[PDB]
From Swiss-Prot, chains A, B:
Family statement drawn from the similarity comment of this UniProt entry: Belongs to the class-II aminoacyl-tRNA synthetase family. Archaea-specific ThrRS editing domain subfamily.
Note from the entry: There are two ThrRS in this archaeon. The first one (APE_0809.1, AC Q9YDW0) is most similar to bacterial ThrRS but it lacks the N-terminal editing domain. The second one (APE_0117.1, this entry) is most similar to archaeal ThrRS but lacks the central catalytic domain; it probably does not aminoacylate tRNA(Thr).
Effect on the protein of changing H77A: Isolated domain has decreased deacylation of mischarged L-seryl-tRNA(Thr), no activity on L-threonyl-tRNA(Thr). Deacylates correctly charged glycyl-tRNA(Gly)
Effect of E129A: Whole protein and isolated domain have nearly wild-type deacylation of mischarged L-seryl-tRNA(Thr), no activity on L-threonyl-tRNA(Thr). Same results
Localisation: Cytoplasm
Name used for this protein in its record: Threonine--tRNA ligase editing subunit
Job of this protein: Freestanding tRNA editing subunit of threonine--tRNA ligase, the catalytic subunit is probably AC Q9YDW0. Deacylates (edits) mischarged L-seryl-tRNA(Thr) in trans; has no activity on correctly charged L-threonyl-tRNA(Thr). Probably does not aminoacylate tRNA(Thr). Deacylates correctly charged glycyl-tRNA(Gly), but not glycyl-tRNA(Gly)(2'-dA76) (the terminal 2'-OH of tRNA adenine 76 has been dehydroxylated) nor the 2'-fluoro tRNA derivative, strongly suggesting the editing function is catalyzed by the 2'-OH of A76 of tRNA(Thr).
SUBUNIT field: Probably interacts with its catalytic subunit.
Length: 136, 136
């Protein structure tokens, strides 16, 4: 699993066209204030342990930034070893569930299987932008 | 070299703290209207051929999107096989130079070696967000 952690002053997205024949989540849109935005690419090897490591690391990083909102943003583009879409959807649901057991703030998982427009204002401090890899 | 192509309605950045002992570019800030924003991670193997392939592909993609502004945005976080900073700076300068021989619009290379805040509004059409790899 490859993640990009972006500490935003604000974030919003809107689903536009379907990217999958039948997206498993409904269309919609949402906007946020200060949040850790986690662009998340699920990789072929990802299983339960990978999800638990990532949930721990996101919670720990959120804690040190003192953010109380996490956005789990499905992203196809961080890796060249993608899981298939149905496995990726399942892992992202698991990740959202695991993160709730480790992090006490707002957890928002964005819809899977859509093209989306988005806007972000990302902070420019030294820890505002980091990448992570998790495996089992 | 790993790139992320983001077709933006608007983009702006500001350098904040130095990320390198002595950044090779001066601090500053800039904002743009519609642009292809190219987040660019230079990798250990990158040489002249890699720069020429990437310059061709960015020009060709810009052409099909009908954009007339390209932002070359140095980014540490797209890969786990980074070139050293002085080689990466040199390759990004080469890339800017090569892209000018292939693409007739505004080319803006952002300063290397800074932490930066940024804002982007990214379009949500099917080709608004793509990743690329180039090697030799
Ligand atoms: C494209 C851009 O506008 C938007 N942000 C998008 O990337 N959409 C992706 C994810 O929502 C999802 N998806 C499919 N496979 C995966 C995977 N392995 N990991 C994560 N997400 C996946 O399915 C869409 C098809 O690429
Ligand atoms: C960090 C974030 O706010 C900002 N956007 C940033 O990423 N800054 C990077 C690039 O400007 C540059 N840099 C160093 N090595 C490389 C490399 N191999 N490829 C590209 N850039 C590099 O040096 C800084 C140190 O990571
Ligand atoms: Mg809508
Ligand atoms: Mg300034």
């Amino acid at each position: 699993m490859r993640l990009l952690y972006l500490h935003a002053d604000r974030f919003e997205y809107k689903t536009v066209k379907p990217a999958l024949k039948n997206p498993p989540d409904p269309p919609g849109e949402a906007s946020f204030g200060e949040a850790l935005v986690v662009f998340t690419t699920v990789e072929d090897g990802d299983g339960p342990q990978t999800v638990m490591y990532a949930a721990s690391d996101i919670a720990s990083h959120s804690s040190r930034l003192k953010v109380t909102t996490v956005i789990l943003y499905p992203y196809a583009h961080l890796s060249s070893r993608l899981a298939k879409p149905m496995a990726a959807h399942k892992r992202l649901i698991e990740l959202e569930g695991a993160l709730r057991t480790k992090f006490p703030g707002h957890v928002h998982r964005a819809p899977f299987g859509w093209y989306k427009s988005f806007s972000i204002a990302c902070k420019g401090h030294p820890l505002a932008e980091l990448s992570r890899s998790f495996t089992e």
